[PDB]
Structure formats: C-alpha cells, structure tokens
Amino acid sequence: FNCTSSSATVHWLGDKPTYHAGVTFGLPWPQGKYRPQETSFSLTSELQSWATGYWADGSLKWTAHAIAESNQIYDQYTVTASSLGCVSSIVVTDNSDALTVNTGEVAVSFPKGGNVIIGDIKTKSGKVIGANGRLVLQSQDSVPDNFDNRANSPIQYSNFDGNINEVFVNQTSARTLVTVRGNHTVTDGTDHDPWLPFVVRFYLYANSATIKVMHSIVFDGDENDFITGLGIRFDVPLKGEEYYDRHIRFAGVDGGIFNEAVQGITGLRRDPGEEIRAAQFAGQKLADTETWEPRVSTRLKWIPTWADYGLTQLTADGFGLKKRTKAGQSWVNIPSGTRAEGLAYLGGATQGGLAVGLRDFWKRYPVGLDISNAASDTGELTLWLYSPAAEPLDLRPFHDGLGQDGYEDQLDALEITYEDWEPGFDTPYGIARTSEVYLFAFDQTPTSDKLASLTAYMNDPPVLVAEPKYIHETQALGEYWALPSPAAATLEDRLQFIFDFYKGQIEQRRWYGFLDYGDFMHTYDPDRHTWRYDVGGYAWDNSELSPDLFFWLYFLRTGSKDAYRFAEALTRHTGEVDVYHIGDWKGLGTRHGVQHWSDSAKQARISQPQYRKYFFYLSGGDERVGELLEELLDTDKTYGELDPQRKVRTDGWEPSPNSTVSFGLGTDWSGLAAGWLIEWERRGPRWEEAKTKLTNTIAGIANLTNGFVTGSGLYDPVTWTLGPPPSDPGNRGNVSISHLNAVFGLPEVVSEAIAYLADDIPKGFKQAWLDYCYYYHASASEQKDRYGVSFSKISLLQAHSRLAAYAAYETKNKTLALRAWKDFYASDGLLPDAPWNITHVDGSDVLVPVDEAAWLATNDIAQYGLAVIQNLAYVSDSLDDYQS
Amino acid sequence: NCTSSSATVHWLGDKPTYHAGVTFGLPWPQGKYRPQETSFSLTLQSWATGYWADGSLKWTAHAIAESNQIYDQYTVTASSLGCVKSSSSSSESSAPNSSIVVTDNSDALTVNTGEVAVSFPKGGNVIIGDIKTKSGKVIGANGRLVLQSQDSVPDNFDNRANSPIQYSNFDGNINEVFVNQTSARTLVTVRGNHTVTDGTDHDPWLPFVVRFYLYANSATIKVMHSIVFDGDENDFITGLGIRFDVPLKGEEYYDRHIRFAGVDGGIFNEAVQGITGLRRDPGEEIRAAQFAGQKLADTETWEPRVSTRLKWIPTWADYGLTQLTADGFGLKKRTKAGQSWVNIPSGTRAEGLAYLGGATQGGLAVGLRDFWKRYPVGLDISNAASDTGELTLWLYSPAAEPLDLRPFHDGLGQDGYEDQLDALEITYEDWEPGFDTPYGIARTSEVYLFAFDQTPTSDKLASLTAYMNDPPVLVAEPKYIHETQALGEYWALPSASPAAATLEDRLQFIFDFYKGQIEQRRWYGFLDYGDFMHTYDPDRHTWRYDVGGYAWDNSELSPDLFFWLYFLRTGSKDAYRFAEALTRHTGEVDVYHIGDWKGLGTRHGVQHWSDSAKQARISQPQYRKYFFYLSGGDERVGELLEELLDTDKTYGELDPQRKVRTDGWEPSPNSTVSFGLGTDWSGLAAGWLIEWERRGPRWEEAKTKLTNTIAGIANLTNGFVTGSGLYDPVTWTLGPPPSDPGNRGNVSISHLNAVFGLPEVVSEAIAYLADDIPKGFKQAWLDYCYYYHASASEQKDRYGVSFSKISLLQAHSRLAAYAAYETKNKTLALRAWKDFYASDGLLPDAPWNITHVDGSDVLVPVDEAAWLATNDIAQYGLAVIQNLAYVSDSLDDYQS
Numbered sequence A: 001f002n003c004t005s006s007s008a009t010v011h012w013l014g015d016k017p018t019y020h021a022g023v024t025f026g027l028p029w030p031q032g033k034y035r036p037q038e039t040s041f042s043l044t045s046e047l048q049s050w051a052t053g054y055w056a057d058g059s060l061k062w063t064a065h066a067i068a069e070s071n072q073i074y075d076q077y078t079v080t081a082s083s084l085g086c087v088s089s090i091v092v093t094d095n096s097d098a099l100t101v102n103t104g105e106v107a108v109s110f111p112k113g114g115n116v117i118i119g120d121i122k123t124k125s126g127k128v129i130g131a132n133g134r135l136v137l138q139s140q141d142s143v144p145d146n147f148d149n150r151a152n153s154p155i156q157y158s159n160f161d162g163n164i165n166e167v168f169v170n171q172t173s174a175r176t177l178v179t180v181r182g183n184h185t186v187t188d189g190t191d192h193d194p195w196l197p198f199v200v201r202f203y204l205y206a207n208s209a210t211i212k213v214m215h216s217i218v219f220d221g222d223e224n225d226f227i228t229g230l231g232i233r234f235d236v237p238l239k240g241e242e243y244y245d246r247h248i249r250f251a252g253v254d255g256g257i258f259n260e261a262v263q264g265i266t267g268l269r270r271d272p273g274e275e276i277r278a279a280q281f282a283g284q285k286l287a288d289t290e291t292w293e294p295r296v297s298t299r300l301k302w303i304p305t306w307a308d309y310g311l312t313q314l315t316a317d318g319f320g321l322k323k324r325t326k327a328g329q330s331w332v333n334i335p336s337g338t339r340a341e342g343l344a345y346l347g348g349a350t351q352g353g354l355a356v357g358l359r360d361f362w363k364r365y366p367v368g369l370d371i372s373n374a375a376s377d378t379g380e381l382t383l384w385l386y387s388p389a390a391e392p393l394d395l396r397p398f399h400d401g402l403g404q405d406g407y408e409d410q411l412d413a414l415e416i417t418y419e420d421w422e423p424g425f426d427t428p429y430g431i432a433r434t435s436e437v438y439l440f441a442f443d444q445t446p447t448s449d450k451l452a453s454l455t456a457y458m459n460d461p462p463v464l465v466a467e468p469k470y471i472h473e474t475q476a477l478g479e480y481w482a483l484p485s486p487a488a489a490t491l492e493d494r495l496q497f498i499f500d501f502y503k504g505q506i507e508q509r510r511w512y513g514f515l516d517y518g519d520f521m522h523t524y525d526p527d528r529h530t531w532r533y534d535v536g537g538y539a540w541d542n543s544e545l546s547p548d549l550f551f552w553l554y555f556l557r558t559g560s561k562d563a564y565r566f567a568e569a570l571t572r573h574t575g576e577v578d579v580y581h582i583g584d585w586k587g588l589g590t591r592h593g594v595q596h597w598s599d600s601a602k603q604a605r606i607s608q609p610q611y612r613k614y615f616f617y618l619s620g621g622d623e624r625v626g627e628l629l630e631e632l633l634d635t636d637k638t639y640g641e642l643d644p645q646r647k648v649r650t651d652g653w654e655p656s657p658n659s660t661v662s663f664g665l666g667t668d669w670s671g672l673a674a675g676w677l678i679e680w681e682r683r684g685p686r687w688e689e690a691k692t693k694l695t696n697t698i699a700g701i702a703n704l705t706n707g708f709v710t711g712s713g714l715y716d717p718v719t720w721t722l723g724p725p726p727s728d729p730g731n732r733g734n735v736s737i738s739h740l741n742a743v744f745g746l747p748e749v750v751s752e753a754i755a756y757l758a759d760d761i762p763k764g765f766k767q768a769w770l771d772y773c774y775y776y777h778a779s780a781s782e783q784k785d786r787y788g789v790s791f792s793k794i795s796l797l798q799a800h801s802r803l804a805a806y807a808a809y810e811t812k813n814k815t816l817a818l819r820a821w822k823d824f825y826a827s828d829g830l831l832p833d834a835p836w837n838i839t840h841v842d843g844s845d846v847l848v849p850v851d852e853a854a855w856l857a858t859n860d861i862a863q864y865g866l867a868v869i870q871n872l873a874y875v876s877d878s879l880d881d882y883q884s
Numbered sequence B: 001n002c003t004s005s006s007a008t009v010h011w012l013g014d015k016p017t018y019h020a021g022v023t024f025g026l027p028w029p030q031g032k033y034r035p036q037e038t039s040f041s042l043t044l045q046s047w048a049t050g051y052w053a054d055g056s057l058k059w060t061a062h063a064i065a066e067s068n069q070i071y072d073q074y075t076v077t078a079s080s081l082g083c084v085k086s087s088s089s090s091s092e093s094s095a096p097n098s099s100i101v102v103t104d105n106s107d108a109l110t111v112n113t114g115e116v117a118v119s120f121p122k123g124g125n126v127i128i129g130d131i132k133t134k135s136g137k138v139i140g141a142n143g144r145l146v147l148q149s150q151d152s153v154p155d156n157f158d159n160r161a162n163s164p165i166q167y168s169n170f171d172g173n174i175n176e177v178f179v180n181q182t183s184a185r186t187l188v189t190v191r192g193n194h195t196v197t198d199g200t201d202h203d204p205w206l207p208f209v210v211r212f213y214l215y216a217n218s219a220t221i222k223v224m225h226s227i228v229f230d231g232d233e234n235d236f237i238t239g240l241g242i243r244f245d246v247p248l249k250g251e252e253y254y255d256r257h258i259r260f261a262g263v264d265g266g267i268f269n270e271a272v273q274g275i276t277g278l279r280r281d282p283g284e285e286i287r288a289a290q291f292a293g294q295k296l297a298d299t300e301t302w303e304p305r306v307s308t309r310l311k312w313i314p315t316w317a318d319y320g321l322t323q324l325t326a327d328g329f330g331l332k333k334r335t336k337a338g339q340s341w342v343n344i345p346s347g348t349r350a351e352g353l354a355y356l357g358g359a360t361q362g363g364l365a366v367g368l369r370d371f372w373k374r375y376p377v378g379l380d381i382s383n384a385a386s387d388t389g390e391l392t393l394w395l396y397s398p399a400a401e402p403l404d405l406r407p408f409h410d411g412l413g414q415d416g417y418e419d420q421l422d423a424l425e426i427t428y429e430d431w432e433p434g435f436d437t438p439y440g441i442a443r444t445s446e447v448y449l450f451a452f453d454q455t456p457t458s459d460k461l462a463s464l465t466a467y468m469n470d471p472p473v474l475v476a477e478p479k480y481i482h483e484t485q486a487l488g489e490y491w492a493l494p495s496a497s498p499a500a501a502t503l504e505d506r507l508q509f510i511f512d513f514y515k516g517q518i519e520q521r522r523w524y525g526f527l528d529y530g531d532f533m534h535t536y537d538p539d540r541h542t543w544r545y546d547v548g549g550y551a552w553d554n555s556e557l558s559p560d561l562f563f564w565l566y567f568l569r570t571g572s573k574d575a576y577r578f579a580e581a582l583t584r585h586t587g588e589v590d591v592y593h594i595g596d597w598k599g600l601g602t603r604h605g606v607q608h609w610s611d612s613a614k615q616a617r618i619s620q621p622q623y624r625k626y627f628f629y630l631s632g633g634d635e636r637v638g639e640l641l642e643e644l645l646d647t648d649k650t651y652g653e654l655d656p657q658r659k660v661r662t663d664g665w666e667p668s669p670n671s672t673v674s675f676g677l678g679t680d681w682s683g684l685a686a687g688w689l690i691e692w693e694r695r696g697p698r699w700e701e702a703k704t705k706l707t708n709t710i711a712g713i714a715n716l717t718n719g720f721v722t723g724s725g726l727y728d729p730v731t732w733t734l735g736p737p738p739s740d741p742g743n744r745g746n747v748s749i750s751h752l753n754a755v756f757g758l759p760e761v762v763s764e765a766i767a768y769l770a771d772d773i774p775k776g777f778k779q780a781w782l783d784y785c786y787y788y789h790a791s792a793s794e795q796k797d798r799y800g801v802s803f804s805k806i807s808l809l810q811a812h813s814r815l816a817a818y819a820a821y822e823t824k825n826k827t828l829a830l831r832a833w834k835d836f837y838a839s840d841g842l843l844p845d846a847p848w849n850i851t852h853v854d855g856s857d858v859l860v861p862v863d864e865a866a867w868l869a870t871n872d873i874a875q876y877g878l879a880v881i882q883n884l885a886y887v888s889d890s891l892d893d894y895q896s
C-alpha cells in the first residue's frame, strides 16, 4: 500500500552542550497523519518512541522520544516518521527481594519493600560504589515563641525513613523509569504515625552513569508537625582505601570545586614529594609509601584524619563550610562563599564513589550537603533538601484571624488587604513540592573539571525541542499564537521588556526558597519600593490572571532558553505548591496571598491544567506532571464539599448531599474542561469519563438559552450533565457577567475543545462562544437587543480584546478586528503611552538597590502579553489598518 | 618662664559628615612639659596617658564634644604655667557651650550630656535603667546583657532524637561601677557576671566589663563590651546579646517604626501597622508621611474606606534579621507568637543597625560595628504591638549552630613529650593534654546606642550606620610623632634612593595583599575577625587552615609591629584599620586573662588556643603600645596591659622549655623560676616599661623588675648569648641558668630571640633609663647585635663556640643596622644591607606578584602569593623599616 512519511527536526535549547546523559523530548504531529503502533520512527538508527497525546480520531498528536548518553553530540536531530506501508540497551533483571537496572555503565538495584530505596550502585567493573540510598526526614512537635523561650518550651525530635509500598518500572532499551512510592515512618525519637507521602522517580538512560531523581512530597502533617531536616542519603564503602586516597569534593561558586583528602599530605611541614602531592590534589592513588620521603611517611599517624564535612546554604546569598576530625571535637571552619552550586562527592581512587547534588541548590535554600565518617569503613553522603541548620519549617498561618467572625467581616477585610480569609482555610494540608536531584557514579575519583561539568549539567539539564514553526504548523499545541510592521515590532520589544523585568525581579527581590522558588508577586508598593509581600492578596501571585499562559506561549513563539527556564520554574511551583493533592479540597488551588496557602478562595482557576499542558507535552510527558494532571480529574467532587461562590451568591443556594452542585461557566468550568480534555487527549485510565463530562457540559452550555452569558449551571455529580442555575429552573434566561470568567484559560480551552470535537460538536456551542466573544464589550444597545439587559460590571477590556480577535478571525469580520485593537490600544491594562521603563532605587529608601515599574502589576502584564500574542495571531491583518 | 608649642591632628581619611565627639592622642618631646602645670587649647579637655623617665608628659589624650562644626584639621597648642603666671593680661573665663553633669547616689549613677540622660544601676541585673532625651522623655529602658547556652551538643543532626539538650538563659549581674568624669566626655565602666534566670543552677560565669563612652552634646553612646571565656567542656554558648525595652504605650500602631540597615547605605523602612500598599489609598500625603517615619494626620482626615478597616490590617510585632554567614542575611517578620514568620526580601551584607520607636514616643537604635565581619549575628525587634517593645543586638545569634570551643582533635594517641615533638616535625603543632583550652580568652565588641526624640529620617539612620562602621579618628602627623621620639626611634618617614622607593612599593604590595586576603579567604567571624594565617598550601591553593601551626598566625614573628610601624610612617587609613582589627583580636582572643597561665598567649595553630606553647611572646605588650597611645589610652587595652604585669608568675607554673631543655631543671615551689632572655624577657620588659611609663599602680615594681633584670643580663658573662636565667620572685633579680651557677659562661642561641620585639623594647628601655642604665648592658646588646652574623671564627673567639643554628638572616639584618648606627661603622651598615638583599626571607628577585586562580581548582576565585609566608612579610617589612631608619645613608653605597 501507500507510504505517508515526513520529517521533524529537534534542536538544543540553548548552546549545544558538551555533555548530556540521555534526553527525552517531545514531537507533535499533524491531525490524522500517523496511527499509533503502526508508524515507525528513525533518528539521524531506530529511536525509542511512545505516544503522549492523541487526536480525536486516535492519530498521534504528541510523541516522546529518548536517546542514550553519547559523546557524539549533534546540532540537530531529525526524526523521520513513516507509516505502515512504507519500506546500547538497558538490561533489567528481577529477583525476589529487588529489581536491578543496568545501563551499560551503572547497575542500580531497587528493593521492593523496606526502608532502603536503593540497594546498591555498581560500575561496569562490578565494584560497589554506593549502597542504601534512603530517604531521611526529621521533625519536632513544638516550636519556641522566641530564642528566650527555649529554656521553658522543650522540643521533642523525631527521625523518619522512607518506607516503600509500590515500585513500578517503565523499561525501554534507551531509558528506564523506576517509580518508588511510600510514606515516612519513625525510627528514633518520639513516636509519630506514618506521614509525608513521597513519590521518587529514577530516570536511567543507556550508557549513562548519571541518574536523574525527581523527588516529590505531599505535606499531610498538621499544626504540630515542623519539618526540621529533609534529605537523601547513601553509604559509600571506603574500607580498603588509605585515608590519603579518600577524596572529598564540593561544588563552589560558579565553576568552582573544593578539593580535599581525608588525610591531607599537601601543606605539611615536610614534603613527601612534589609528584605525590599533585596526585592527591588530582584525586589519584598516591604512590607506594616506600617512594615517599620518610620524614613524612613515618609520621602519618600524626596527621589528623577528617571524618565529617558540612556545607550549609541557609540564605540565598551565603554558605558556610566546616569539617571535623570526629564527633566530640570542635569543627574547623573552612574558607567559604556566596552561592554553592550544590554537588558533593565522597569516594576514593581505588574504591570509586558517588556524587549527589540538587538542581538550583541555593535558589531553593535552606539546603545542605554532608560527608560523614569518612575515616571509617563506610562513609555517608547526605543531601539536605531542607537543612537542620535552618529554623524549623513553619507552615502555620501568618495571622490569627484578627477577630473576624463570619462572611460579613471576612468580606470587609477583603476590601482592605485583598485577602478573603476563613478559619481552617489558611492551611498547607495537601500541598507538594518536587525537587530535581542527580546521582553520578564513578569507578574512581574523577577530575575536578569533570565534577564542575556534571555540576553545570545538573543546574542546566540539556533539552531538545521542536522548531517553533513546526509546532505551529501541526496545531498540536493551540492555534491562539503565531511566530513573531513597525507597530508589531514594538509589541515584541514590549514583551521582551516585560520578560526582562520579571526575570530580573526574581534575583533582586530574592524570590528563592524551598517552596517559594518559582513564584513571583502580584502588586507593588510604590511608597516602600517592595512588592506587597505583606499585604493580603497582593503578595505571591499563584497564577492569578494566567501568567503561566503568557510565559509558556512566549516560549513557544520564540524558542528562547531563558523563556523555557522561567516558565518551567513557574510550572514547578504553581502546580505543586499552589494546589492541594489530597483531602476534601483536592484538585483546587489557592488564590494569591501572603503564604501560598493562606486565602480561603480555593478554586479550580488556580489548579488549572491548561497551565501545565504545554510543559507536559514539551518535556516528553514528564511523568510527575502526568500524575498531577490525573489528580485534577477529582476536581468536580469538591463542588459538593465547597461552594467557591459561598460568600457572595445572592440566590440562597447551598450544597446538600446527593444533589446537583453549582459552578461558574468561566472560572470553574474552564479548569474542569481543561482537565477532561487533557485526559481525553492522553487516553488515560479515565478518558471515557473525561470525554463524557466534557462532551455533556459542552452540550449543556449550548442548550442553555443565553449560553455562556448565563452565569453558571447546576451539574450532576452522578449523571454528569449541565442545567440552568438555581434561579432559572425553566431555562428561560439568566444574565450574570464576570470580568474573571474569560481570563483563566477559557478561550484557550474552548478553542482547543471546538477543534478536537470536530464534526461531533454539540449544535450551537461554537455560536454561544462567538456570542460571548462578540457581546462582552459590544455597545449597551447590542447587548439589550440580544439578552434583554446591558452588561453591568464589565472591565479588563484590554484582556478581553483577544476574544473579539478570536471572533473577528473566525467570522471574517474586519469591523470587529478594529474594535479588538481599539480595546487593546485604548481602554485599560497597559496603555501604549504609559511609562514603559524601569526606575532605579537605592540609598536609604530601600534595604538593597532595586529596579521598579510601579506603573504595572502582574494582572496587567499577563493579560497584556496574552492579548498581544493572540491579537497578532488572529488579526495582525487589521493592525496596519488600525494604525492609520 | 613661658614654653609653648603646637601639634596638628587630622582625620584618618576623608573629613567626616558627622562625629559624636572623639578622643585622640598627642606626644610631646622629652622634658618639655610638666604634668598638671600644662594647659592645652584647640584651634579642650586633656589628661596624661604616658610619661618620660623625668616625669614630663610623653603622651596625652584629648577629647572633643559632639559638634555640627567639623574642621579639616585641629591644632592643640600646649603652654606651661609660666605663660599665664608671667603675663599681666586680663582674660575671660567662660563656660563651654556644652558640658556633662553626673548626679551620684547609692541606688544609681546618672550621666547627662545635654542631649541625653542615662542612668546606671549600681547593682542588679539591668545595666542601664533608662535613657531620656533633652525633654525628659524616656526613649529606652532596662538595658541588659543576655546570655544563652546549652549543656551539651549532639554528634550530628540525626543524634538530636537520642541526645537531649538542656537550654539555660542568663543575665548580666553588676558587681562594680566606676566613672571617669570630665566636662567633654565621661566614661562609665561596669563590671559583672552572668547569673541564671531560666534553667538549672549554674555557677556565675562569663565575666564581663562594659564601657560606655558619653560625650558632651551627643545622643550617641559608644560601648566597649568585653567578656572572658571561663566555661568548661559542657558550656556551649548559644546566644550572646544586649537588649533594651522601648516604650510604645501611646503610639498608634501606624506611627510605630521599624528600621534595619541594609547593604551599602540601604535602609529597610516599615511601620508596625502599614498604611501603604493596601487595596485603598488613605491619601498620598499620609503614605508619604508613614514611609518618612512622621506622625500621621488624624484618622478623621483619611479616605474613610481605610480608617474604618484598621482592625483588618495586620499588626507586626516581631522582626528578625540574621547574619549567619559573612555573605548572606535573612530577614523576617511576624504578627505574634503561635503564627508563622513571613519572609522579607533580604540580601548579602547587612550593616548592623536596627531602630525601634515612634513619631511621638521617640525611640532607640542599637548596632554593632563590623556586624557581618563578626558573624553569626542578629537584630530582633520584639513585641512592637505591645505597650513595651524590646530591641536586641545579638553578638552571637541563637540561629547559629552553638559556639563550640573544644579541641579540634583528641590527641591522636600522643603519649608524652617525645610523641608531641615528633608530631611537631610534621604538622608544626606542639600538642599537649589539657593545653588545648579556651579557658581565659576574651573578646571585645564595639557597640553603639542612638537615642532619638522622634523617629529619625532614613538619611540620618544610614549616616549613623556609616558613622558606626567607620568611627572617625584624629591622629597626629607622622612627622611630629617621629620628631618627638615618643613611640620608638626604630622607624622614620618614607629618601630619594631608587632602591628605597622599590622597598616602599613592596611594603604597599604586602599590605594590599594581606588586606585582600581577609575578604578573599573570608577570615571573618565572632572570634576570627582580625587575625590572618601563617603559611600557604600551594597545591590546594589555600592557607593551611587545617594543619598544625600553619593556620591562624597569632602574631608569630611580630606582624603586629610591622603593621603598626607601617601605619606610623604613612598615616594611611586602611593601614590603621588593618592594624586596629589585628590588635583587637590578637591581644584579646590569642591571650589568657585569668587562671594559671594568665598573661601568656598561644602559639599559632588551627584554633587560636589549640597549641601547647603558652608564651609571653604572644601576649607581648609591645604589640599593643602603639595603639594604646594613638587611641588616647584606650581603657580596655589599658586594662589588658595591666594584666600582663602578672606574666612573671607563670614561670613558676609553666616552663616554656619543658620539652626541649637538656639541663634537668623543673619549677618547684618557692624557687627561682627559669625564663628566656630574648623571647620571654622581651614580653616581660615591655609590660614593665609600659607600667613605668604610665605611672600606674604598679610602676615602682615595674621600674625595679626592668632595671634589675637589665642589670642581671648585664652581669651575665655572655649577656644575651646565654639564653636564659633564673629569676627570683621575691628579690626580683636575675641570675645565671641552671647549667652555669658559677656564671663561668653559657652559650645558647635561638633564631627566635630577637624577632618578638626584643630590639624595640631594648632601645626604648635604653633611652628610658638614660644615665641610670646599668653598667655593661648597652655593650651586651651591641655584642648580640654584632656577633649574631659575624664570622664563625669571630663568634668562637668571643664565646668559645661558633653559633650553629642561626637563621632569619634578613630578619636580623636590622640588628646590624642598629649596631651600625650606634657605633657609626659603615662596614657593619653594609652587612645589614647585604643580609637584607642577599640571604633569606624575601629576596629582591622573588616573584613579587600575585597569581589569580579559578575554575575547578578552588571553591571561589583567589589571588595567591605562594612564594611568601607571613613570617617572611612580617620580618621583611620590619627590616625595611628599621634599616631605612638606621642606615639609609649607607644604602646607595651598597647598591654600587
């Protein structure tokens, strides 16, 4: 028969790297081109392939591919897909106890139960270089009021271990993913029930001794659980190794490395030999002692032996480093520095060893690294994701309620700090955070140049990506954007400006930390020259008005590394820390506030899977994000437990059991719809359900009289249908407009759902959408002639310009296009003749020098960028017509 | 009849923008002015710090009140009594514009500067009762010392669960209070103890002395806080601080103000209840007013959507800044205990000031000079939503890991002198059981207190923070110091020889390098700041921080003398600062101030107290003399110089030669004690000569010991070449060593004898004694200077053996220089220059540059000079300075 074939080409995200340890990348395909399992793939050899997404007709939409570690590194990789009629391997082995993965360079064994995540790590030769990878956690039960209170407020410490429940394996030749889940169980200390659920993923690639370790946790503790240390630990066997042949290294600042031995032979009073000393520094096995100069070799007993080393990064700006002969002795402080790049190695020239490290180490402070008992038969190497040298992690609420009593008071407080408080809602119960850890194995102590390289690898892991242009052709990732007229040029320069300022504010406002890193804030205080870190709703942004959409689309269009890294970090924060992953509110995220979990507005607009979609697919179906997207399918359950509109709805409705549940058609539904469309696209375990709930609710909305202009609907949790809201039992017509409904993914989700449903789209839905896009900011007359009232509380007109643009493009209407551009250039948001620059502030006005743009807030820049991107993609033809 | 003369004094660097009154030193030519018959005027409060042998003023101190009028220079004219007693001119007596009064009763001392009144209880657990402004308004109260500690430490973080910690809290308990009152400045010295407040019974410990300098017309108070470490293996300091209450009862929350000094002139500016950056605007002027620390307008004039809702704007009671490394600080606030802390955008290096007060109540600022260089440190505001806030400076932060001063090693199985000396051969450490103890070390901290009648501007706070981190200093001209000869004859000003000019460039090279190494190698810390290391590890590209005696330098080969003489010759600010900090470390932390070894200091090692050589060459008060006089008799150093007069008693408890001596001698009770004539005696002599110069309470004693020991060395057959003697602690006399009871003649040479301040003390001593110099001493000193590097035959001829283990030829070149000056022997002067340019130490063809190192070889990038060690630079620079001074007439001659 026929052959349908095509090529697609994948490039390195920034500069071509000098080292990579295997990579997984994604590739989109046009609707209807290639059948799954039928279509073969080759790289420029056979190429590890698998599907992450499917079109509605079940053809391939996104794939994921993997290549082995190789020192041949090319500029472009070309994947050729060929249909049915056209013309280095990992070895996993199974025992009763444990599963072994062997890449050709390392063999790592994962037990199937117990408190040891990794049994041992061997190199090619077979020598054990590390053993007993284990999770550590320690906690306390009280916290003292202040430092003075420690004398009359005892502390009870508890250590814990990772206990395994399930081990899963996804084996291919090129890469194997081991997924280990469990809980943290007590060991020593005061007694405590199992808590702090974990999942730890291990990506092994063929021909690599680098292991990427995605480590995720859910906080399920309460008010009395104060995390004290969090980390990963290995034993490093040293027994047959002369102390002068045992090596310690830490990564330093930039490309630095600290280079010591457990028994130092350099810097002594006597010279063993110039060759010998240079060998120690180089991590080499020293010559036989018979060649040393005897005034040294006869005196080794008098040269101290250094068992413990500890690096502590407690601010984003400074680290301490210290070492100790053994316990019971004081530590000797070591010359330290600002920002450790966050890798440590323990091992030997003969026995080999292990480096462990954390990506973005100092940006996720307080962290640390420990070598211990390096004078013993077995040393330990520990990575602290949270350091005990830091203050205990206190997630409890930042204020006590202020004497607020009921919805009247809370809504009043809302008018001043923009925080909508409620008791019991200011809770971290069920948040998460994923930490990207790296293990490197070595047959012998490696060179310093090598450790610095693997350190830099870790902090900027190579990424392969599709050409932006190719992505656009396929329509596999939205149609609401195009690739980058003098007027348009200054739109792009303005997006560049927004991006440069936000990337800059991360550093200047010091938006780093275990949980904080990734987010940014909402509104600025012009008097104090700070962002409003301490005023209610004006603090951490938590995806308010879809900055996630802006930043990801900004990456798609450009292919910029900086863009990808900014959006990646954002995604790793807002998807983990700003949403609940367990409990009654599971699948909701929390409105912008002072803590990431302080506000009472738990809503699906924060936990909005559209925000993670672009990263899910571009990363090659990142499994952690995959898991997170599956969690959000239980978001509909919450409307039975919690009414997001509970404080302000006027119609007397409340949730009862076995009843229908209310939700908005823009805010809430946009998040549900997107969850359902992603699962459908993925064909996951719950895809038939997802297709039914999306398909029904769409038909629901079409068969409402006023369509989207209806405020909300009533949804059935058992039958999965959508009917009129409480105050219109007979679907005669309700009008309830909100300025929030469109700005959290609605148009993006709807355009994707319309395209995906193809000829099966419920009659009149597309037109109900066009009706919203058209009449939101039409004249009050055109509104009263259509729905009987004019739309009262309209605002965000710049932000809604991209709706007019959608309708304009789709209805081929040049008049509407000009109204869209008029709304963009001459309503609100960021006017074109606003200051469009930064002002520098220093001296006694501020703690440190900063750049500011008091004239913008994050609500403005997110919707400005989305408007620009979308207005240009839909109606750049009418832009020149608008300027003249 | 009349005798009058003038001396000018300059600011150390640039003219300051503010000062808070200042003290300074001035020297006077031998024999010119009598004490108590000599008046001083400024173009002035005055008192003597030092005296010449005939009782005429050698050094004086001088004090000026705070003034808005600041000059580029200041001239003190002295005048004998004859100048007024002879003239019949009628002249006006008028009060000074400002002048301190102190009222004194059994309860409490009160000091009033005209700008503040502060009260010092005479007993109790509260150092300052309260602080009032001009108006009478109380701005702060119950100034108190705090201390916190723990009874043990876990092996590691895991071990917390099985190793419980018993926390204790302590207070400063007052025992004595003193006053040195004068019109323009007043000094309250307060001595005490720390006693338990919370936790199990603990004997009183951690002796303190705190000194408050108050100046006329000044609301600024300088504070020298000194503590001695008398804990044991179980006492882990955790928390060391100074706390005040600030009365806020009566200030609206939105008129209470918090300020922290940030980085490079930055200030953090907040209110306890913030009116800025709310959803609603109370009015532009009102916000502008809050950020400025001004009292806000009446609530009735605001936009009412804010005044209705103040109840819903949280209130911030606690603020905490922590500087737990030299490179980064944290900053956080919270509503009240039982809530979490909210994090605040922070940064690198905080300049160490916090203010708490209000627009109406006024308030207090407190800070630590050199804050981040002395990490770990902190500042806490407490309870600023209550009737009473607390403001606290932490000299040691509880947020740091506890201070552990125990040994770094267990001894490594060394059993006795033979094993200890064999370990000396490889790490350069001289270990001994129980000798590795911090028992009796001290540390002084320079703190400031600022009273405000109302929340001050931010410009003012930053201006005061800068004041505090760079306190203005008034010094005499180098020329004048040199002319008076009041601080040694062994240095002089920077000659036209091109060779001399490359010597000067090389001392600038050394200084600039040592200055940068402090920052590059992060030699900062609560106890470390001020010291530097001893030898380098060229492979690892670090100083040998982890190898015996190659780590902290502890004044080995007298770097303190080089850096002080380098300041004297030049007037350089950086130079003064380098040396001041050095002196503040070396004479506090590197020496013991109580116990059996009182008045010894510790030999260079991995800890400041690790090594077993406990010796007077470290405590060596010659190392503090130049600063003692230049500061205007800094009273804490003054005090330290007094303790060292007890040094001679140690020779009965501890032999420094115990391990190496071959003569079978040991101390025993009521017996003559053995000490060295070079290293040990130069420490002793220096302490005695200073007590004599000061006419302090032990001067007659001091004069006798110095004179008798000088006389005793004179009477030894081979004088200095003998090595040591036997000192009688009752007759204060010096006889020959145990191997030579007949005084027939003994010979024992060490390369170390001259390089710990001997030639400096000996010359000063010789000029002090004048006509009453014991017979044959100058000759014995000349003999040593000449014979050291004379020929082997010359030595054999005078003393019966050649001198076999002589080294440090460059270092001793200055002895030949001195002898060449005193005998006017050109040929000997040329020897001095030959040993300088062509023996050891730093040769003129040494690399004489730095190499930059980076990438994966090191943690951070560093500049190195592997071709030098501190021993080398300290003696090179003394050689340069002393050879130029004695024998520059012969330098061009050498170069041809």
Ligand SMILES: C[C@@H]1O[C@@H](O)[C@H](O[C@H]2OC(C(=O)O)=C[C@H](O)[C@H]2O)[C@H](O)[C@H]1O[C@@H]1O[C@H](CO)[C@H](O)[C@H](O)[C@H]1O
Residues within 6 Å of the ligand: B430, B549, B556, B603, B612, B613, B615, B617, B656, B657, B660, B676, B678, B679, B680, B749, B750, B752, B753
């Ligand atoms: C006898 C003592 O031995 C060691 O504690 C130490 O000497 C070693 O270190 C040094 C040094 O740091 O300067 C130099 C020596 O070559 C090493 O053995 C002490 O310095 C030393 O005390 C002194 O001993 C000599 C004995 O000849 C001098 O008399 C000197 O006056 C002593 O104070």
Ligand SMILES: C[C@@H]1O[C@@H](O)[C@H](O[C@H]2OC(C(=O)O)=C[C@H](O)[C@H]2O)[C@H](O)[C@H]1O
Residues within 6 Å of the ligand: A414, A420, A544, A591, A600, A601, A644, A645, A646, A647, A648, A740
């Ligand atoms: C019903 C919810 O009520 C509040 O918790 C929130 O609303 C306030 O917040 C915002 C916002 O977008 O952050 C805008 C409103 O104008 C304001 O009153 C939620 O947004 C509501 O859905």
Ligand SMILES: [Ca+2]
Residues within 6 Å of the ligand: A519, A540, A541, A542, A573, A574, A577, A578, A596
């Ligand atoms: Ca967040």
Ligand SMILES: [Ca+2]
Residues within 6 Å of the ligand: B531, B552, B553, B554, B585, B586, B589, B590, B608
């Ligand atoms: Ca020292």
